[PDB]
């Protein structure tokens, strides 16, 4: 069996020195060094444990290269925050403001009464 060697002066098997086997057109198994696994961004909410959809999970210094559309999604808070947490933020932020208005109304009635 064809055993093989590392292709770089880094001898030690490390986070940096990860590999994979590949058959070339020359018909010799050769190590190719592999790129680290990128992660999708997690939500700005911080409770939803699941990572975001519609974003290319890639090593962050790549994002540079990528097009805008890969990096985000067409929504308010797009590619920063999961939908669920937006549509709860939305209705929360609305419902809160409706009660603030109700308390303002109850305050104004109390001033007019007194």
């Amino acid at each position: 069996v064809q055993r093989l060697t590392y292709r770089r002066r880094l001898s030690y098997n490390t986070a940096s020195n990860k590999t994979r086997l590949s058959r070339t057109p020359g018909n010799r198994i050769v190590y190719l060094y592999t790129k680290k696994v990128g992660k999708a961004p997690k939500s700005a909410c911080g409770v939803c444990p699941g990572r975001l959809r519609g974003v290319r999970a890639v090593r962050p210094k790549v994002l540079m290269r990528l097009s805008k559309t890969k990096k985000h999604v067409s929504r308010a808070y797009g590619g920063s925050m999961c939908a669920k947490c937006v549509r709860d933020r939305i209705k929360r932020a609305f419902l809160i403001e409706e009660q603030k208005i109700v308390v303002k109304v109850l305050k104004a009635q109390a001033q007019s009464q007194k």
């Binding site: 709860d88 209705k91 929360r92 419902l95 409706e98 009660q99």
Partner: protein, 94 residues
């Protein structure tokens, strides 16, 4: 007590358990009452509370936590929100 009057509603009346379904019942304008467990999420409650206000519907805050309410509907599962469409012969609705 409310547990007694519910018992009868669940037996004889028409009803619906859960938030996805009761919000659809209120939105239709069929729901005559809405029971909320006490442990219900605060956003959820206030949302429902507003939906009843728009549909001129009763909202009864249940004394117990969602496990107690589901127990109190005669289900082994747990229900946080429950709408009462048509009571059978109960006076749950006054």
């Amino acid at each position: 007590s409310i547990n007694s009057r519910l018992q009868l509603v669940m037996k004889s009346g028409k009803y619906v358990l859960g938030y996805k379904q009761t919000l659809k019942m209120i939105r239709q304008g069929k729901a005559k009452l809405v029971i909320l467990a006490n442990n219900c999420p605060a956003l959820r409650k206030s949302e429902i509370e507003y939906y009843a206000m728009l549909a001129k519907t009763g909202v009864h805050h249940y004394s117990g936590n969602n496990i107690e309410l589901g127990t109190a509907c005669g289900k082994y599962y747990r229900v946080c929100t429950l709408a009462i469409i048509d009571p059978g012969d109960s006076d749950i609705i006054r």
